[PDB]
Amino acid sequence: IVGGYTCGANTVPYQVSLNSGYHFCGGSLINSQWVVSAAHCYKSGIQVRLGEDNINVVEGNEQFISASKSIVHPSYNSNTLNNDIMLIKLKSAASLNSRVASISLPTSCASAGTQCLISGWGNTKSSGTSYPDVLKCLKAPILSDSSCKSAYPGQITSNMFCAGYLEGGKDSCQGDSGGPVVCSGKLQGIVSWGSGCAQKNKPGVYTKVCNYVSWIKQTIASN
Ligand SMILES: [Ca+2]
Numbered sequence: 001i002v003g004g005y006t007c008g009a010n011t012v013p014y015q016v017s018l019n020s021g022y023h024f025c026g027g028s029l030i031n032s033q034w035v036v037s038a039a040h041c042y043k044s045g046i047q048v049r050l051g052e053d054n055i056n057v058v059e060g061n062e063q064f065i066s067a068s069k070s071i072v073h074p075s076y077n078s079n080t081l082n083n084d085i086m087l088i089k090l091k092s093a094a095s096l097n098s099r100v101a102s103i104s105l106p107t108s109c110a111s112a113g114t115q116c117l118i119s120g121w122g123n124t125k126s127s128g129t130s131y132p133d134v135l136k137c138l139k140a141p142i143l144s145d146s147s148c149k150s151a152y153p154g155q156i157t158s159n160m161f162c163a164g165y166l167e168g169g170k171d172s173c174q175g176d177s178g179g180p181v182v183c184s185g186k187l188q189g190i191v192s193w194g195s196g197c198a199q200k201n202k203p204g205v206y207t208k209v210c211n212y213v214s215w216i217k218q219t220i221a222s223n
Contacts, residue, residue, distance in 0.1 A: 003170030026179025037178035122175025173197035
């Protein structure tokens with residue numbers, strides 16, 4: 001996260017870390033057995049880390065759980081990043097408490113201007129690379145579809161939204177992918193892609209979770 005602040009330990013109880021011997025993506029807990037993340041974070045060997053603040057120190061409150069399976073959206077397109085969503089089933093059910101809790105799915109899409117909380121352990125630099133130990137947070141509005149499309153003409157599908165600041169200085173960055181975008185208590189977005197980090201007129205692009213609620217529900221029911 002570039003331009004954000006320290007969240008505070010366990011204040012984003014639905015944030016997960018995907019680990020393969022290092023932190024490579026984020027994700028959100030949506031029930032005791034399932035995490036949502038981005039299709040592009042897809043790899044074998046994933047250990048889901050819940051209740052993490054400092055990802056380098058065991059502090060207490062962590063639960064380390066192997067993914068049992070990862071489900072990339074069948075229509076995911078790695079050139080376009082259209083349908084950039086993935087579900088991960090935990091080998092066993094997390095223990096839900098105040099530190100480790102699930103985020104609700106929206107029942108309707110958010111409008112332009114809604115303020116959301118984005119969070120991750122990704123690079124905190126616009127230029128160069130500086131990874132934090134602790135979770136960082138950012139408040140960012142959802143931009144209008146007109147602005148989003150005039151920033152990335154021919155690249156925005158109806159399953160993507162833009163959020164952030166046209167002025168540069170504040171954004172998600174390398175490391176943050178798969179992580180939540182939460183707006184009024186629901187998960188509206190997934191960190192997906194952009195152009196550099198916190199560059200002027202190049203806001204971050206997010207997966208539009210409201211378009212996937214049925215798919216999520218349907219796939220979880222059958223697995
Ligand atoms: Ca830790």
